[PDB]
Amino acid sequence: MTAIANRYEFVLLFDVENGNPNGDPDAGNMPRIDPETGHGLVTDVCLKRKIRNHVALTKEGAERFNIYIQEKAILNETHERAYTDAKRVTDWMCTNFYDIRTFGAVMTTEVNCGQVRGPVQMAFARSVE
């Protein structure tokens, strides 16, 4: 196993047709609008949730690709793990949970304060117009 060797930046263009891409819990579930520009807004956490769900569906409990932060799409059919003192448990979590390895996580541990950062980072998505 070896980590990636290059820095990456990506731009993703997605559209919505007659739908609510991301409701605003502070505007009666209306789609988010940017007050400064009037552009539609989609938080990063929404896209991260979608990515987590997609990977959970696609790999469905494979060896290295379990998803920790679930949203009631879980299935209890079958799980397996790599079978690897805080560093030990941190590496074990990273080595077999895709979302922890990708976005990071924070455990209730003291020595490192829990901070697992992860390489991937996403910003708020806003409408073109």
Next chain:
RNA sequence: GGAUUGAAACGCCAUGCUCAGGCUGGCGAGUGCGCGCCACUCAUCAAG
């Protein structure tokens, strides 16, 4: 390469505007009103 009160963080699941109801019943464009009163095609020119 230890720490940007940070690191992780869906507003989300779903819900017929429907059932229906004449713009109708009936009402002359009509009564009447000269295109009419006049005005040369005409004054000439072998047939070869």
